[PDB]
Each structure stands twice: as structure tokens, then as C-alpha cells.
Amino acid sequence: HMCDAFVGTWKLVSSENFDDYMKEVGVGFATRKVAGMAKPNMIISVNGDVITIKSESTFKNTEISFILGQEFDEVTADDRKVKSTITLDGGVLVHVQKWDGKSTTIKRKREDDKLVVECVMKGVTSTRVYERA
């Protein structure tokens, strides 16, 4: 019953500051424009100790599977090759990505009937809000 309140299919309903977050990460103009238009569904499931998170949109379909605390290599939707570790910290899923001496953190939390995603790169934060699909 690890992550039960996260499991399901979620749809993006609002975004703030995502273009600025992508700029801080190093995403180029064309990819920012198309990515910023995306309205993903996020699908989260658990089978034993393995968590799977899928993001599906017209921009890209991605999938990661992982065990908490156990690093993995990830190819991001913007084509970064990163080393990722995802942990649970006080009920929040915390996803750290490292690449080229840089780091970004993506936090997922349940708030009311929403799943709120905060993406942070240095001083720039983007908030993406999801509801059940």
C-alpha cells in the first residue's frame, strides 16, 4: 500500500511557469513550444516494490519503472540522459535527476483531489496540477 493515493490515471488541468523551468533546464526553443502545449495524462501504478509512471501526450509518451531509493538511468522527454533516484519523503514522491553536473527535482504530492507536481531547477519552480481522469 505503498503509494496507494497516487495510483491511477491523472490529467493535467493547470500549469504555471513551465516555460521558465524548461529554460532553466536547458530545453531549446522548438521543444519548449511543443512541450509547453502538451496536456499529458500521467498514469501511476504499483506492482510489488516496482512503481511505474507513464506520461502520455501528443508531445511524447514516456515510461519509467523503479524501486524507491534505487538509482536508474532515464532518457527524459527533452532527450537528456540523466541519473534518477526517486524516494518517498513524508508522503511526497521526490524524483532527483542528475546530468552534466546539474540537478533538478520533481516532487509529486496529493492535495485534496489533486495530484500536484512541483518541478524545481535552481531558483525556478513550476507547478503542474492534475485531477483524476
Ligand SMILES: Cc1cc2c(cc1C(=O)O)C(C)(C)CCCC2
Ligand atoms: C510534457 C512534458 C515535457 C517535458 C517534461 C515533462 C513533461 C510532463 O508534463 O510530464 C520534463 C519533466 C522532461 C521537463 C523538460 C521538458 C519536457
